[PDB]
Amino acid sequence: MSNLLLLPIVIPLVTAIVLIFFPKHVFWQRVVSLAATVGLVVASGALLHRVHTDGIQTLNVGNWPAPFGITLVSDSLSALLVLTTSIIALACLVYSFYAIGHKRETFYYYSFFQFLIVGVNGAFTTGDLFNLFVFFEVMLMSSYVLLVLGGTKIQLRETIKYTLVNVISSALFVVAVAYLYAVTGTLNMAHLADRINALGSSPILTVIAVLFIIVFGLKGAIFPLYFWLPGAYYAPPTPVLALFGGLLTKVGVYSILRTFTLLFTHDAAYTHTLLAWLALGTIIIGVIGAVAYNDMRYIVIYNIIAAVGVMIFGISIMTPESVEGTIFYLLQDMVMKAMLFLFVGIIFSITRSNDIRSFSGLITSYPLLGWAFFIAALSLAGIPPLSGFIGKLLIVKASFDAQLIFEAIVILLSSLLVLYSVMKIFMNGFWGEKKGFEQKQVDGRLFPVLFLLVLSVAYGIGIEFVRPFVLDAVNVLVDPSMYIEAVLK
Amino acid sequence: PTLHIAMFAPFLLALLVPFFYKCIRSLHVGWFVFPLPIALFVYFLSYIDDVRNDEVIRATMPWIPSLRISFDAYVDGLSLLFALLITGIGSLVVLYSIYYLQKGKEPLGNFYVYLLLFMGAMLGVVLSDHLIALYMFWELTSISSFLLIAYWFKRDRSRYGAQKSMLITMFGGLLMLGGFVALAIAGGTYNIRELVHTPLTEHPLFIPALVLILFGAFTKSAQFPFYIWLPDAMEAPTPVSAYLHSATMVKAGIYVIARLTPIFAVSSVWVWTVALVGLVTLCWASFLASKQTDLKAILAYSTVSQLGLITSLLGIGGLSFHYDGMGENVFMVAVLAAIFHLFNHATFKGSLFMVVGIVDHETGTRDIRRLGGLMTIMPITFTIALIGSLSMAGLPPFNGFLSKEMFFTAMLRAKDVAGWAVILPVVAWVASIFTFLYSALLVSRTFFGTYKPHVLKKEAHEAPFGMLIAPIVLASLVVFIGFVPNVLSDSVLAPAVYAVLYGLFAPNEALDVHISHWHGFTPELFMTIGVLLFGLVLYRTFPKWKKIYYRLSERMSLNFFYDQSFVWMERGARSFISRVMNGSMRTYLMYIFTSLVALLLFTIGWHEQWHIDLSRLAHVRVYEVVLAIGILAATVTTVIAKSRLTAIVSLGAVGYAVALFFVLFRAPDLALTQLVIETISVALFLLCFYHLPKFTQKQESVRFHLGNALVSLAVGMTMSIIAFLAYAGKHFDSISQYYVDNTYEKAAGKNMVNVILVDFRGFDTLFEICVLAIAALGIYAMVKLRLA
Ligand SMILES: CCCCCCCCCCCCCCCCCCCC(=O)O[C@H](COC(=O)CCCCCCCCCCCCCC)COP(=O)(O)OCCN
């Protein structure tokens, strides 16, 4: 009944637990994880229809009232993020069936997979700050182990780096929760939002909001807090990397979004001009890194950084059109970055090399993969029949309506430069004569990538279907009074 | 509505092409592509009766109705002119490509898929009434043209040309999108025909929309300085060159300028920007077109020059909107001139490309210095080339007479509003001189001279008739609008002028009696005679001023600047990431810590930080003082320790004394768990110590760097002062009266830390159990799995 909201959290959790008992039986690992992920997708779709039909769904964990126990809240944005997470998880799991070798999946691989999706799905639906802390460490601990699993020298080194950074940011989130508890005295989102709005003219709230910016920008890579991410994402294997690029940096973006649309609304001018300048720096760093490299993984990594910057710039304007555009761009960018890492993995499987300058002439031997990557590149850029057009269109329109000409031109030129990076991959890798590779039949793993591509194309065609969910999400984001009268009954 | 299945029919047939291509192996696939443009052309002949008697055709297909986006379609005179051009020259280029390409040596299904995507995209560009739909069709045009230029992907220069054309036209298209969005905010709506009936100059977003739309429209139609991509798009197949770079894509910016002229030509920035950049690229391409040594580069710079002519006439036709002195109304003539030469250019330019394509695969070369006497070898294509070149030069019996005399008539009557504009026609005049030169040189170094029986290929150079069909039809249409200019004017060209100059015709008889005007002694006649005589006396002496012309053409170009600009951009970005991304973790920690300190201290210093209330503070007691002195001693001996065991045992002492604080601040559970966890963790540190490698170990002290010490003191004092500011301000109390009031009355417990951990907030204890489980499984996986 009303526990439907926990079915994105409970279903992978149970699954991860029962995958501990039989490590050496890889067939039943695959069967149980596949069936549970399909059930996760079905339950998340049912939750999205539930939050669409009647109102926002709130569940107290015990029978305890709203300030005093843990409350889980699913609005329409969190349900959309859960469904997007479920689709990405299913595609990455089937790619994991074809891609991960035998030895790495005898040692608890699918358990760690399910714990990572537990962490992200719990992070998108929570109503407490410290519970959100705990879900961040579930997510981060599973990401540490998935990064290090296999134990070659490269992933040892960058697991040390990645672990060091996330320990520092975890301690910083602890001290931020401590400061905010000393000011307010509560721990759930809605009641401390009410308490912050009861004393909104104090400077310490601005200082703690800037501290949350620093923490969540260490989580999802903002300038000047991005520096850990290139080597850390250059380390892991391909489906693990698709999980990381699809999911990990985008929960920091959602946390920034929830923080500045729910908690900190008084004295908005300083916080929003800070977000604007950090977002502009993030976009510039991302497009410079995308132009600079002749290496596929680095190109997709800096495209992650650039798209995060565009989303943060959409957050930095308190207009419903900009919020609508960054929600559209958020969903399609999660799906698209997971898709592009799976493409890069297939191309590396063919070429036995990651250098763009080493190989050419893949259209003459792999036409479906080539034209799929062509459509994926043009959908990443923002060409209008494809997915990522209406998001940046609404962002550009909301920036022109608020008199930001230069920043809108920065967004459009960033779209140009990210198109140049991915089309550099396409034109130097797929076109040309044949010199770099040897004919090797790919199998199986192409189909989850094609499934993601078909869903992205159908997303770009069918904006009118997927829009009223985003409209209810915008109606709850730009008005937190409905959020705090839904929880605090 | 029957036009919805006309706009989206080339896309469906582009879906169906490879089916017919690999399932019908006998018949050439282009024949199956052949009827559809024919059908569209015949369908587009069905609207002329409704457009002559000033009636328009409107259609709507909604796409996102809540974001207020549709595929609108609006059909009037200008859109019919462009649609008839697209479909007629499309069917002719399809026929020429049937007879040009081969069957068992060429991928043909790719060719006709790309071409038919381009045709559907261009028909969508022209017919569109919605701005976002227009931008969508614009982008599809750019992508399909990018595909068509690189048709031979196994050769380098095609990929260079496709990359450069892609980057330039995408840059223009994105700034075009920004201008469209600014215009749609300036007006209330998105549809073009409702932006006309509303005022837009009293709005701040009018000039940025003007500059961005104008920037994209100059980028598409190869204006100055953006003409750079069009001479390198000549590595395409010859039907691609003919169709795209004669009639369809290079006129899209022309269509946008002519379409939005009733909105933006009320300002002077639009009309003078358009006119001046048209004159500049006319003269610049007319100068540069005589340097080249192959046919297609000459025709590419020719295309750039006549596009500049058309857009300069569009600028003077924008000057028509302000005022006309006492019913003179002369500037409207410029509009007609533009539209006439627009239509005119398409026809002969298409034929000329087809001509050079023929002679290419009838000789093997296309350079000007190997092919000589081809008059009595190839008479029919010589006739077609002579007709096209004399029409391009601007000579009396062919089309170029009316085009050039209306051009000089429009330019001479436009200098009578400002004195500096007296500079403008004579500059344009020498452009025509330059024009004649290359056109004369074209024919006079293609077919004249003598035959070379040693380098050439074939004893018989007789061309097939099927290749020759479409240039004959284009040359016949050239001759027909030459000798009979009245019927095509009164049928097509007049409602185009009534479209471009909307809301301005209070009478309509002056335009009609100027269309019916053909002869009468004009002062522009001896101007054309002087063009002819000076081009004749300039061409005969051309091997004398040849070196001066070659070195002055070397003296200024624009591909040098673009190539070095991209080398600069990639090298600067690469040196940026080689500077700031060093790889050392110490440096990135310095950047993160410094940014943390800077943002927090600036946020504190920006405010005034009032209301320091020391009344919350508790009374200090001696035991906490002595224990604080103890853990300060352990902290100081763990930062200044020479060996690492000393830092390990000092971290242990810090842990046990934090446990003693937990005892002393009334926290028993914290003390128990803290003692056990610190004993286990210190055992793990001693595990990590004694397996250090014996080489390069050396047991050295902590190295002192001044920046690390400054950053560390700033971090500590920053979080200290934030803790003091937060703890001693205004506050709401807490929510723990409920937990001390309902631990036993509602739950079953007397302990309160444990009841919070398992009953009130027990939902997060489950996931810290999960964190410990992941940690143990990960330690097992790291130790046991050693695949390397
Ligand atoms: C005071 C704590 C009160 C609570 C009681 C806690 C008791 C347990 C504390 C943690 C125990 C960890 C045990 C680890 C193994 C230690 C013995 C083996 C290692 C060893 O001898 O290392 C030497 C010890 O450090 C040295 O020789 C220098 C040691 C410096 C310790 C500094 C402690 C400051 C505390 C300040 C007051 C705090 C009061 C709190 C109530 C380093 O020397 P090496 O390199 O020569 O090794 C000799 C090579 N054969």
For residue B54, the one-letter residue type is D
Dist. CA B764–CA A173, nearest whole Å: 16
Q: Are A9 and A122 in contact (CB under 8 A)?
A: yes
The distance of A427 to chain B (nearest Cα, Å) reads 8
CA angle, corner A263, sides to A258 and A267, nearest 5?
Answer: 120
**H helical segments located in B484-558:** 486-488, 494-500, 509-515, 524-539, 546-555
Dist. CA A488–CA B752, nearest whole Å: 24
Dist. CA B74–CA B130, nearest whole Å: 9
Cβ burial, residue A365 (10 Å; 0-12/13-18/19+): middle
**Token pair for residue A350?**
């063919």
Which contiguous run of DSSP H or E holds residue A131?
Answer: helix A129-148
Dist. CA B763–CA A131, nearest whole Å: 8
User: Which of the residues B568, B770, B783, B786 would you substitute to probe the A interface, choosing the one with the greatest number of A C-beta atoms within 10 Å?
Assistant: B770
Give the Å distance between the CA of B678 and the centre of ligand 1. Answer: 14
**Token pair for residue B612?**
């320091």
Dist. CA A130–CA A173, nearest whole Å: 9
**Token pair for residue A280?**
């502009």
- Helix A203-219 and helix A153-183, axial crossing angle in degrees, nearest 10: 160
Count CB atoms within 10 A of the CB of residue A60. 18
Dist. CA A307–CA A314, nearest whole Å: 11
- Of the candidates A136, A124, A11, the residue with the CA atom closest to the CA atom of residue A74: A124
**Token pair for residue B46?**
């069905």
What residues contact B666, with CB distance under 8 A and at least 6 apart?
none
Q: Are B33 and B116 in contact (CB under 8 A)?
A: yes
Cβ of B143 within 8 Å of Cβ of A378? The answer is yes
Alpha carbons within 13 angstroms on the beta-carbon side of residue B626 total 5
Dist. CA A330–CA A323, nearest whole Å: 10
If you search the block for the tokens 């009641």, which residue do you land on?
A: A191
**What is the β-pairing status of strands A71-74 and A57-60?**
antiparallel
- Of the candidates A458, A386, A375, A462, the residue with the CA atom closest to the CA atom of residue A423: A375
Cβ burial, residue A43 (10 Å; 0-12/13-18/19+): buried
Dist. CA B550–CA B521, nearest whole Å: 40
Dist. CA B622–CA B634, nearest whole Å: 19
- Helix B206-220 and helix B252-264, axial crossing angle in degrees, nearest 10: 160
- Give chain A positions within 8 Å (CB) of B184: 397
Dist. CA A374–CA A453, nearest whole Å: 11
Q: Are A205 and A183 in contact (CB under 8 A)?
A: yes
Dist. CA B555–CA B552, nearest whole Å: 5
* Chain B residue with Cα closest to A466: B64
Q: Report whether residue B663 contacts ligand 1, using a CB cutoff of 6 Å.
A: no
If you search the block for the tokens 């508890």, which residue do you land on?
A: A181
CA angle, corner A174, sides to A172 and A179, nearest 5?
Answer: 95
For residue B298, the one-letter residue type is I
Dist. CA B136–CA B217, nearest whole Å: 15
Dist. CA A186–CA A129, nearest whole Å: 10
- Give chain A positions within 8 Å (CB) of B185: 397, 400-401
Cβ of B592 within 8 Å of Cβ of A224? The answer is yes
Bridge partners for B59 per DSSP: B73
Question: DSSP per residue over B657-717, as a string?
Answer: HHHHHHHHTT-HHHHHHHHHHHHHHHHHHHHHHTTS-STT-TT--PPP-HHHHHHHHHHHH
Dist. CA B519–CA B523, nearest whole Å: 12
User: Which of the residues B125, B592, B784 would you substitute to probe the A interface, choosing the one with the greatest number of A C-beta atoms within 10 Å?
Assistant: B592
* Cis before B225? omega within 30: yes
* Cis before A224? omega within 30: yes
Q: Report whether residue B649 contacts ligand 1, using a CB cutoff of 6 Å.
A: yes
Dist. CA B759–CA B744, nearest whole Å: 12
Cβ burial, residue B67 (10 Å; 0-12/13-18/19+): middle
Whether B140 has its CB under 8 Å from any CB of chain A: the answer is: yes
* Backbone angles phi and psi of B46, in degrees to 5: -85, -5
What residues contact B573, with CB distance under 8 A and at least 6 apart?
A288, A289, A291, A292
**H helical segments located in B320-422:** 332-363, 379-393, 400-412
Dist. CA B711–CA B705, nearest whole Å: 10
**H helical segments located in A149-237:** 153-183, 189-198, 203-219, 229-234
What residues contact B60, with CB distance under 8 A and at least 6 apart?
B70, B71, B72, B73
If you search the block for the tokens 């909104």, which residue do you land on?
A: A200
Atom of ligand 1 nearest to the CA of B652: 10
Q: Are B168 and B229 in contact (CB under 8 A)?
A: yes
Q: Are A234 and A301 in contact (CB under 8 A)?
A: yes
Helices and strands (H, E) in chain B, number of each type: 34, 2
Dist. CA B520–CA B505, nearest whole Å: 25
3-state secondary structure of B426: helix
**Token pair for residue B447?**
């077919």
Contact pairs from chain A to chain B, CB under 8 Å:
244
Cβ of B732 within 8 Å of Cβ of A199? The answer is yes
- Helix A238-247 and helix A109-124, axial crossing angle in degrees, nearest 10: 10
Q: Are B723 and A207 in contact (CB under 8 A)?
A: no
Q: Are B138 and B173 in contact (CB under 8 A)?
A: yes
What's B758's DSSP letter? Answer: I
What's B237's DSSP letter? Answer: -
- Helix B131-149 and helix B108-127, axial crossing angle in degrees, nearest 10: 150
Dist. CA A376–CA A450, nearest whole Å: 10
* Backbone angles phi and psi of B484, in degrees to 5: -115, 95
Alpha carbons within 13 angstroms on the beta-carbon side of residue B288 total 23
Distance (Å) of CA B529 to CA B405, B433, B478, B519, B521: 11, 11, 22, 16, 13
Q: Are A307 and A249 in contact (CB under 8 A)?
A: no
**Token pair for residue B23?**
């399932």
**What is the β-pairing status of strands B69-75 and A71-74?**
unpaired
If you search the block for the tokens 């494809």, which residue do you land on?
A: A386
Cβ of A151 within 8 Å of Cβ of B787? The answer is yes
- Helix B268-288 and helix B295-319, axial crossing angle in degrees, nearest 10: 160
Bridge partners for A58 per DSSP: A73
CA end-to-end distance (rounded Å), chain B? 67
If you search the block for the tokens 């003296």, which residue do you land on?
A: B555
Q: Are A436 and A359 in contact (CB under 8 A)?
A: yes
Bridge partners for A73 per DSSP: A58
- Of the candidates A457, A444, A260, A439, the residue with the CA atom closest to the CA atom of residue A376: A457
Classify residue A108 as left (phi > 0), alpha (psi -120 to 50) or beta. Answer: left
Q: Report whether residue B643 contacts ligand 1, using a CB cutoff of 6 Å.
A: yes
**Token pair for residue B44?**
């587009």
Dist. CA B726–CA A179, nearest whole Å: 6
- Give chain B positions within 8 Å (CB) of A412: 174-175, 177-178
What's B128's DSSP letter? Answer: B
Cβ of A432 within 8 Å of Cβ of B786? The answer is no
If you search the block for the tokens 């940025």, which residue do you land on?
A: B208
**What is the β-pairing status of strands B57-64 and B69-75?**
antiparallel
Distance (Å) of CA B42 to CA B16, B45, B98, B125, B494: 22, 5, 21, 19, 21
What residues contact B59, with CB distance under 8 A and at least 6 apart?
B1, B3, B4, B72, B73
Q: Report whether residue B633 contacts ligand 1, using a CB cutoff of 6 Å.
A: yes
**Token pair for residue A371?**
């034209």
Q: Are A332 and A391 in contact (CB under 8 A)?
A: yes
What residues contact B162, with CB distance under 8 A and at least 6 apart?
A427, B146, B149, B150, B233
**What is the β-pairing status of strands A71-74 and B57-64?**
unpaired
**Token pair for residue B298?**
């000459």
Whether A412 has its CB under 8 Å from any CB of chain B: the answer is: yes
Bridge partners for B57 per DSSP: B75
Dist. CA A317–CA B308, nearest whole Å: 42
Q: Report whether residue B645 contacts ligand 1, using a CB cutoff of 6 Å.
A: yes
- Of the candidates B89, B674, B157, B163, the residue with the CA atom closest to the CA atom of residue B349: B89
What determination technique applies here?
cryo-EM
Alpha-carbon Rg of chain A, whole angstroms? 22
3-state secondary structure of B588: helix
The distance of A203 to chain B (nearest Cα, Å) reads 6
Helices and strands (H, E) in chain A, number of each type: 21, 2
Which contiguous run of DSSP H or E holds residue A282?
Answer: helix A268-292
Q: What is the length of chain B? A: 788
Distance (Å) of CA A386 to CA A87, A380, A389, A391, B718: 19, 8, 7, 11, 48
CA angle, corner B95, sides to B296 and B159, nearest 5?
Answer: 40
Q: Are B179 and B211 in contact (CB under 8 A)?
A: yes
The distance of A233 to chain B (nearest Cα, Å) reads 14
If you search the block for the tokens 């027909």, which residue do you land on?
A: B480
If you search the block for the tokens 């990443």, which residue do you land on?
A: A380
Q: Are A119 and A140 in contact (CB under 8 A)?
A: yes
Dist. CA B428–CA A194, nearest whole Å: 72
Residues of A numbered 198-257 whose beta carbons fall under 8 angstroms of chain B's beta carbons: which are they?
A: 198-199, 202-204, 206-208, 210-211, 213-214, 218, 224-225, 227-228, 230-231
Dist. CA B169–CA B140, nearest whole Å: 11
